[PDB]
């Protein structure tokens, strides 16, 4: 239930396009106990984890040094490309 992520800076349209081509997925982390953080996660790894935990399963996100348990609040998908364009992670109060 753990997948590593990398933080992101301000991005141009080209950068995000390169990220998705690389196979990484742009994402944001929000919720209780966390400020909004923009993160990138590998698509394949995310898909494996979500299968293990399910759609609403709690996930351990390696947000920089800290690790935050998160849920997939929402995701954006491209039907033609069969690719997840964006993922929203909601922090869960424990």
């Amino acid at each position: 239930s753990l997948k590593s992520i990398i933080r992101q800076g301000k991005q141009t349209r080209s950068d995000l396009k390169q990220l998705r081509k690389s196979g990484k997925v742009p994402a944001v982390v929000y919720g209780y106990g966390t400020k909004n953080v923009s993160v990138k996660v590998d698509e394949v790894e995310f898909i494996k984890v979500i299968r293990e935990v399910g759609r609403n399963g709690v996930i351990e996100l390696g947000v920089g040094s800290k690790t935050i348990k998160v849920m997939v609040a929402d995701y954006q998908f491209d039907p033609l490309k069969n690719q997840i364009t964006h993922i929203d992670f909601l922090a869960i109060n424990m």
């Binding site: 759609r55 998908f77 039907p79 033609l80």
Partner: protein
């Protein structure tokens, strides 16, 4: 033949065809569906031909949902006329389809049966298509 019972305006501007599908890009009523990968007008006749083909192969055991409806009327001038002197009479009814739009949805059959049924439907339609399933 699917067509609107009434319209406020019988003579309408032809729809914009450039761009990607606004909605109906996900299978919501059935297990499987046919996704358009190209843009074209879809006529009421084309819908019926595709519908009849898919139902026959399915043998009516499965349920067919037709996602697209031909709302827009289109006109044609009478034959051998010069330009001008007003717009022509209504000739047909069409649905604008852009890449991503799910044309039809099928349920109550095995995938193999659905794939063949949608294949038979695809050959009746102007656009290029891809077989699609509900995504979770």
């Amino acid at each position: 033949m699917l067509l609107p019972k009434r319209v406020k305006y019988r003579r309408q501007h032809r729809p914009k065809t450039t761009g990607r599908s606004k909605g109906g890009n996900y299978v919501t009523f059935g297990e499987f569906g046919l996704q358009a990968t190209t843009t074209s007008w879809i006529t009421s006749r084309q819908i019926e031909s595709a519908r009849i083909a898919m139902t026959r192969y399915m043998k009516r055991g499965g349920k067919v949902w037709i996602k697209i409806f031909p709302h827009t009327p289109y006109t044609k001038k009478p034959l051998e006329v010069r330009m001008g002197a007003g717009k022509g009479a209504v000739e047909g009814w069409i649905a604008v389809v852009k890449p991503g739009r799910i044309l039809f949805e099928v349920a109550g059959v095995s995938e193999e049966v659905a794939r063949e049924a949608l294949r038979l439907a695809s050959h009746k339609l102007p656009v290029k298509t891809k077989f699609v399933k509900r995504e979770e």
